[model samples]
Target: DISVIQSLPLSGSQAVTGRALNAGARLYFDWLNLNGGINGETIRLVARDDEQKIEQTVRNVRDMARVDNPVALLTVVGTANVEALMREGVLAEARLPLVGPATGASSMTTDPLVFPIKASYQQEIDKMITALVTIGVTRIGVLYQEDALGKEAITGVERTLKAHALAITAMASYPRNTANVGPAVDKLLAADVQAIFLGATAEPAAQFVRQYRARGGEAQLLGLSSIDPGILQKVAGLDAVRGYSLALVMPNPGKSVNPVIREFNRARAAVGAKDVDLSFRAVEGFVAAKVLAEAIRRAGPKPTREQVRHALTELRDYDVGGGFTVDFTDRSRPGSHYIELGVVGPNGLVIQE
Candidate 1:
């Protein structure tokens, strides 16, 4: 059996998202193993909690490399953590493929060792800006975390607004892993923004929305796919999130008619995951596992790390069930550029519109 390791923020403020992703990945591999496994060799996943700390993530990756010697790393979370891994040459030196990172940094697109599965922050934010402008909401504000991921998201919003002959009304940033959004909320409220784009994760984003609304800041709330709607709704309440929109990299797992969604539902049920509901993060993990499984199958039985990487690079038009297809070349990495917009309904459910 081949083992894979994942280092994600399983115990921090983003734990809700990290746990959901881990569940999805586990369900996919568990289902695969039950049905003949990966080329008859069961795939084992060893997950470690990074706690959303860069130091913990680095340590976890080192331990995984030295001890587990995993075939590849699956769904490592956070931009800073991934950057640290790249700078430390962990993946390169180990010749390990980093697949399906839970980040939308553009750097991931250019990295040979990292294969992302979702649209970049640039794509997601661009779609959000475009949608906002179409609705005649141009006076926008940006609330972002002070980190690499936040900076990349702000850059995307800026570039999109410039292209559309618009500009940001105000911008404020909060420190990472903190929910202290009072200052940022005050700044945006002072600017009297018509809309606010949140470049933050679930906890901080939810905090900002609740604070903003409490202060009578009625700007439309927009978010990236990184924000988990369920968590936000739970934290900020349905009234705070109702009508808030977000750019989604994947179709709504609950309502999509896609065959992939159907398969995911079946697999999720088989795993008896009664506590967790279907979510975008879950879908992402499932998709990543499916894609990785295909690459492993193409690598043949008893495949080496190099063989799996080569198989991934050569993959083209590979249908990962449901009509969803992906392609990769030596020159271009594999990922989906698909983006959609969703809004929180009165009932706190995210409805794709």
Candidate 2:
């Protein structure tokens, strides 16, 4: 009986991200359970809330490792907390494969131990830059958190600019957990940046947008994949978010022809979770469960952690009910780069534009 523990910040200041992540995993787990459990072994998921605090999240990880004895850990929380684990060497010492942390920060993938679930922050940033270039916005600026995640994103942006023979007119950083971005807004506006790519959360990003526009900056807003369209809708309002753009992810539940999502939604409705966003975070959980289920099946029941890890490492071109499949091999990472571009409409975030 292998238990998979998921640690996220679902009930605190970072509730928006937390909720979306948890919802994603839950939907997946629900669908997996319907098939008589994984490899005839009942899979149990124990969820914990980190409150978006590094210390608390780390403690939660330790507790799961020491007490819960979960076979693996799925993290969908903040980049700051994830970095704390990497810097402390806790991830390596524990040998607990961290899968699909919600953030797209490059460090999450560069670290051999961390398996990123979404596209790299660099990839997402480059996608945004490409879109901005198509829009003829030459003078761009960036504001990110002063941490490993932000640095990686800024580096990606710089690389993208160099590729296009463009450059950021202004770059700035803000303290992590910042609720105020007025000053950063001033810096970007002062530089006369026509478009700004924000590498912060929804609240900070929206706040920065509000203040930037209020100051008559008129700099168009862009965001990383971490930017939740729902949260942006709430914080910036439909009008403020109109014309805003970013990279979007999440299996389209409404696209019923997709067998995986079709089956997933059927299970979600069975479990009374039909009203959910079916966001990428939710699909992440489903994908994790699907992959783990395959591992368990390949192990022929009662698999060890090492067996599951081996299964995951060897996974390639395997469909997990989403429109895409997992491909982990040389020069390719599973679950990274499943990406798309989206723009905010008066109705909400509409994708593929």
Candidate 3:
């Protein structure tokens, strides 16, 4: 058996993302295993619940490295989790390849072992900032979580704004994993920014939006794709998120026109019929699985971990499906660059804008 393992939050606040990722990825792997199994080697996806904690991720990766002997790690969930592995020398010591870490922070692309399948935080904010600029909205404020993801957004927003000869109007941030954006909202409201770009996860963003809208503070609100619409609806409801814009690293999963997503939908139904409901993150997980499967196939039977890495980096302009392509010919460039802008629709679901 050729086993690939992922250590992520299977429980706790971010379990929604973890569950969605697991379902989508497992759907792909299950189909692959049923059909011939990567040169007759059954691919097993072993998961450990890190509970969104950094230390647990390190330990999980180590245990998997020593015991499970996985060729690569797929869909490791957080920017902080990845950073912790790099900082504590887990990645280098193991020389383990990490594929498709869930966060889109630009910083992760610097590490050669890490393959990021999603658009970077920089790319997302750049798109949002350009749209905001084109609409003649100048005064902009930022509300970010106090972490690497937030910091990446701030850097990108500042750089993009500087490119167009503008500056940030104001900034505020809540502590990581806390919904304490009330104070942060006060700062932006006082600055009276023409628009607000939120760099936060779902729960905190929900509360921030709720409190901000309740206080009659409106600033063309936007959120990072990390803010899942379903979670936002559950936490803050429809009134708070209606018409809010958001960054999208993938096509809307509900869109039947996308060939990649179309295949995913069919595969989910025919093979893994018990999967959780579809979402943007679920499609992302499917894509990540497809990317790894290609790499493993290219690695051939009885391939080593290093061999898989070489095969993956050698993939140039490889199309997963429907024009979505991942290229690693230039190591500096890293993985996919697909992005879209979206808005919250009447049902509190994100719709293409």
Candidate 4:
């Protein structure tokens, strides 16, 4: 049997999202094993909790590579954690294939060893800004966590707004992994922003939005895909975030028309995962697992790391299950680059826009 290792924030503030991803990937692989396994060898997953710390994540990844000698690395969370590994050349040194990291940082797109499955933050922010401008809402504000992930989102928002001949009306930042956003809210509200974009995780983002609303700020709230709408709804209350919008890389798990989503539903139920609610993060995890399974299958039985890498790079317009397709080449990594806007309904459901 071949095993894949994942290092994620399984015990921190981001644990809500990480757990969903882990569960989804586990359920998908379980279903696959039930269907006679991949290439006749059952796949096993080993997940390490890094607690959302960069140093811990790096250490966990290095240990997995050196000790476990995993066939491939599955989903690793956080932009900074990925960047730390990249800076140390961990993937290259370990000679491992990394698939479906839970980040859309533009810096990650340039790495050859890493294969991302979602759209870049640039694409997501560009689409959101374009929509805001199209609706005559040009005075936009930004509240971001002061880190690489936030900076990447800011870069995208800046580039997109510049193209439209507009600029951010106000900008504020808070420390990473903290909910101390009262000052940021005060600054953006004082500037009288027409809309606000959040570049942080679910907890802090929801806290900021709730506090802003409590202060009588009526600006439209928008968020990046990393902010789980489920967590946000629970943290900020449904009414506080009712009209909030977020960028999504995958179709809504509950209402997607794609065959892949339907298959995912069937597999999820078969694994007795019906107790867990369907979520965007869950769907993304399932898709990532599906993509990696395809690459492993293509690499043949007893495939080496280099062979898996070759299979991934050679993949072109490969459809895992859904109508959704991914292509990778010598010059570009695998990415769907699909972005959709969704708004939180009164009842906290994600309503696609």
Would you list the C-alpha lDDT of every candidate in the order shown?
0.83, 0.72, 0.83, 0.82
TM-score of each: 0.95, 0.89, 0.94, 0.95
Residue pairs clashing, model 1: none
Model 2 alpha-carbon drift over 4 Å, by segment: 252-261, 274-276, 331-337
Assess candidate 3 and give its TM-score to the true structure: 0.94
**Candidate 4 lDDT by residue in tens digits, 1-353:** 87888888787777887787887788789899989888899888888998888898889988988877677887788888899889988898888878888888887677888988888787788888899999999899999888998898788888999999998888999877567888998898787788999988767888898888888889998888888887788888887888888887886765656687787878877877765567778777888888888888999998777888889887787886655777766435436856788888888778787
Deviation in Å, model 2, residue 323 alpha carbon: 3.8
Error of 2 at 133 (Å): 2.7
Candidate 1, residue 279: how far the Cα is off, in Å = 1.2
Model 1 residue 309 lDDT? 88
List model 1 lDDT by residue over 42-133, tens digit each. Answer: 99888999988888888888888778857788888888888888888878888888888898887887778888877778888888899889
Which TM-score value belongs to model 1?
0.95
Scored by Cα lDDT, where does model 3 land? 0.83
CA lDDT for candidate 1: 0.83
- Name the lDDT value of residue 319 in candidate 4: 81
Candidate 1: regions farther than 4 A off: 330-334
Clashing residue pairs, backbone N/CA/C < 3 A, model 2: 24-282, 25-285, 28-286, 104-121, 119-337, 250-280, 260-321
RMSD of each: 1.6, 2.5, 1.9, 1.7
Residue 320 displacement in candidate 2 (angstroms): 1.7
Q: Please report, as a residue range, the 10-residue window in candidate 3 with the lowest summed lDDT.
A: 268-277
